[PDB]
Symmetry: D3
Subunit: 264 residues, 6 copies
């Protein structure tokens, strides 16, 4: 029957998986957007958040850390630099129609890669019963920040595991029952397979990004707007527009032992 | 060139003939069967002693809240024993680390290296940890600890108390990586496809007709992806490089 | 206007960043090696041509090579001496006279904040103009020590700038340094090669000072291999024996979907 | 004014600390056992003296009891399950309904925050008025699970009351909870005893319910030990068989050079 | 001929030890504390009476105070900042200028080589004669950070003495430092008390500085405690108010079956 | 049963447990002495090990570490010292009848307290199947060395865990069968309940101790010798001898939930 692989491949995607990419969000009624440090949802996927906040979809944050380290000022202690930074995200979010932010409070550059941490995200997933999760892609070539790498990993890991009753069993017997999230979307990806048109809202994104004043001196912004405009244009060039934000959405089966998963 | 052919002397033609004993290492109950169940039968038919190592106890492989993890392990242990016999596998070592909680550490290496230094095997099988998009830590960590333990089992100063109780440094011939996206040698499983599925179905906890109805297309499609690459409809794939390509080699992928 | 014009302006005008001789400002750099000899077998030829031109080349050794033998009667400490001496038998013959030994047992190198806090000390100590390390992204690399060494180098360098990372090194006199560049060797993705056919002769020998590692019997498998690597590089820019490394602007190491375009 | 004086005028007067009846105004208590059986063996009798009197009793069980058999033929997985039944059994025979299974394997109970964060969760939900736990300062206690269980209770009772501790609990509608009294079983430093003479053959029956720990051949050694223990305790308050409990000021668990003085 | 005889001729001739006068050489000390306000509470007095004699007193605070509140409004990062402040207006009262902050979050001080590397650092630097730390064998002490600080401190002191321990301190010109003495506050077995009869008012003031901990409602419990503890130590030497320390020869800390006899 | 607790105490000890303390080392053919650092078995135990050769008991060491930190010598490295000390102990052990020494090779001062270690001891116990296991008391007031504390606990934990076929199963799976030790005995204790006379063996014990040259310069032997004699004196008085060695032996049942183990 199945002449070759590629004949069975396209049938496994349309018939079996109901896999689609012109509109993967669409039916989204609530999505948590996971970021390693505060400002990552902004820089990563700010426009697409506003878009999903103009469409009346509920956007919740989980911020892995407290950005305790993002300063060169030999006189501004991380403890407050972090106070400074929970304000700057409470600002940023307010702009983007992000209302809620869970704060995991793990110190910056010290985000563990453990089960403890997975018990945080799995806990939050069974409670906010989110339709999709927005996490950063960990297989981003040359990514050198452990927090980024680990975040996307736990993100996808906690996701697949939240369905699992015997995982963090203490959750089951206090009200929280397993939940099957609908889609996983990987911002900060070098292999996007769905770009959102953000050409328009590309001016509210920098005001959400810059809102983090602590992280953005005007002096350093002299290399970051030239930077951000370069990135967003690369996502746009894939679907012929001025600005773009890129995501990787794969079917749930391709996140595990799928040798051909690099074809979509 | 002069090295592939005339310094190390490796071949992508047939590597398994010289093997009389091999270890097939799997992260969970069934990965041997899903990853390589046909090549498994093959070797056992051809009269080769196939031994499993299971890293973990499955404990987490369910959505049925009535079912405790503890049982699932039991139930899956026997389900594996069914599956193993179905393929000619003789002994399964059970590491027993809890599912989704496989450590990446020396203790765990130290285990693998005990066994390797007892079965003194010619070939080991494992999941390719550089498999792109592998999202399951248990799997990544199995690949890595496998390739690691192997190499290390040769080094008398590693788990140095193993020696003092008999078990000597061994030196496996090959390492074979199933569940890989860079196979450089395939095997024909068109001969034994349906039996494989049967063995893969022996894990009833895992493959309800409902789930199996969704993984039925998957497991056939995969084995095609590999199969096509030779000239058959159904094949299991493998990355084999063994030697000095697993350590510092900027042209490793050219094979 | 387009993606390529914004790309080129980003590098040339916004971030400058060399590519034709990035060791032009160079005076003091560190070569971080997992085991003793990991500078040798990948960076050695490059190390003399820098000790020569004025650069005080500094070493950090991540491990102590404790595990590097087959000899079932050679204690792991015995080996660790053999290697250290053997290493000095190579430090010098390339023009390096300071080797920090971290001292962590071969095959037991932690990937922790702890180790980072060390590197950082040895980076806030010198204030080097550049650091070397193996590329942790070298495909199929199966030895944990290597992978970890790389990753920590990069993360440590970056982190040395932040006053809060190791907030005790500050308070005690050691202040943040902001390293100039980073270079990854042992890479299958170079972008700046370096000429070594002349000093290739010196290298052959410095990679033997570690003769516990490099015996006679084995060498008959490890020199054809060694020549091949030095071919793989060199012949892609001209000569018969060159060495190519990877170097990026500090900002391609974070959130850069277009990093591997170089 | 003396110290002897400035001691009494604190317990009765600054703490209202009564040792006559601490299990008095107690409408819900928690029983943390390191293994299925522990509660029964140190706690057993005393559970009944609370259970039936409208005091709701809940076990937390730290391990799966996976390493309690010297039987080649019994896998730890099967044993774990077996013990669920024996504990489900035993716990009716004492009027306990709810038991949380933490499922940290036998001999591998972590000493960490991650374990605290559980006990802390369960404690905030159930909002009990009392927590029972093994005295972790019991001389010669060899079993880590045992030691750790106590420390981990004491610590989770002090910290259930902290908003900034496990903040995600608050964010999901489980607010702080202060426990009135900590009572340590398996102590040798009691200061309140419990006469359980009529309930003894019941406790032994509730302990014996574990057919995997107390086989008839093991029962010839543990029955005399079980009895001796119970004799050790009660013989202090004039009664034959008793059970012992240490109870202190919440203040006395921290920084007190004289907390030994009760 | 006997034991009691061996006890003394060791103490007095060989180990030249005296309970008499231990602090009579003090030009530099370090007072280590679990939390911010810890050198206060149990040691505030002696410190001032040590500033007086021109002795430089340094603080090392192990935590950031992250978790000292019951009010879901006050957030740890801030609460920390509020506590970094309070111990400066408390340290000044007592001529304490230098305070090292390790920043380990409240209820999370690790027990590791790493945190030893830190205290051994600071100490190889400030090259002091005197280290103070809580008595990690203080009965019923139930705060992790408390226990872990004495052990770590002791271990740390004994551990500066060695070049191989943290040899990167060495390689950047920070040498072995032997310490003269060790004083364990918060002890139930002190053996050399000090006099704070007049100083018990600047005491409640230096402790008072920590108002985010000591609001005036909850002060009405610790008000009898802060005195009572100074009287426990008092009725031991004659004066009205005390601060006790255990001081033992560097030899008794290890393998000494009769440490309990001094 | 019987009436008073004291009566149940005896009855449990004499008849029920059948544990006594006249000469527990008697029926011992094989014993293992566990020491934190190389030289500890010498110091604490020395004499009683010479004695146990002088009868015909095979005596095995497990040395938890490698002494990698035992020097004030600004010049001398750990690596070589660890090499130096594998001799000093081989020398000092041949002067006592000591034939086998297991080197775990944990770095001095860095010995883990973890399953990984237990498994390491459990691998040896099971193999040599000894009747006797020796180790430091870990409840020793003021003992400030993590290795000495940890090594005691891990010993007790390891003796008991050897019996459990579910603990470290692969051992079983390769020959190594469960083993049950007749007794555990704690040196470096301060509640000993049995001494061994070593007065006429003392001098030799010192030769054994001082055979660790690196640890005892002439300058250091000036203080350690009175101390050492002082120690061995302390145990003396108890059995009315010049020099003693203390041990704590307790029934296996006392190491667990016994609120009166303080009483033997
Ligand atoms: Zn970030
Ligand atoms: Zn699997
Ligand atoms: Zn290497
Ligand atoms: Zn128990
Ligand atoms: Zn404190
Ligand atoms: Zn020692």
């Amino acid at each position: 029957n199945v002449s070759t692989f590629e004949e069975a491949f396209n049938k496994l995607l349309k018939e079996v998986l109901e896999f689609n990419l012109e509109n993967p969000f669409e039916d989204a009624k609530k999505v948590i957007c996971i970021e390693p440090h505060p400002d990552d949802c902004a820089i990563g996927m700010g426009g697409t958040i506003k878009k999903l906040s103009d469409e009346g979809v509920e956007v919740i944050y989980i911020c892995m850390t407290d950005g305790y380290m993002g300063t060169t000022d030999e006189k501004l202690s991380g403890h407050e630099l972090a106070l400074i930074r929970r304000r700057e995200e409470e600002e940023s979010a307010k702009l983007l129609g992000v209302r809620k932010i869970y704060w995991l409070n793990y110190r910056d550059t010290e985000l563990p890669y453990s089960r403890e941490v997975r018990k945080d995200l799995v806990k939050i997933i069974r409670k906010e019963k989110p339709d999709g999760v927005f996490a950063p892609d960990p297989w981003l070539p040359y990514e050198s920040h452990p927090d980024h790498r680990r975040t996307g990993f736990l993100a996808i890991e906690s996701v697949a595991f939240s369905q699992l009753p015997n995982f963090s069993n203490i959750d089951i017997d206090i009200g929280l029952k397993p939940h099957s999230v609908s889609f996983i979307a990987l911002y900060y990806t070098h292999k996007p397979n769905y770009i959102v048109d953000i050409t328009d809202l590309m001016e509210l994104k920098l005001k959400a990004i810059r809102a983090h004043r602590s992280q953005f001196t005007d002096d350093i912004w002299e290399t970051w707007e030239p930077f951000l405009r370069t990135v967003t244009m690369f996502y746009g060039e894939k679907i012929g527009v001025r600005y773009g934000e890129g995501f990787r959405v794969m079917p749930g089966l391709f996140y595990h032992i799928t040798p051909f998963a690099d074809l979509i």
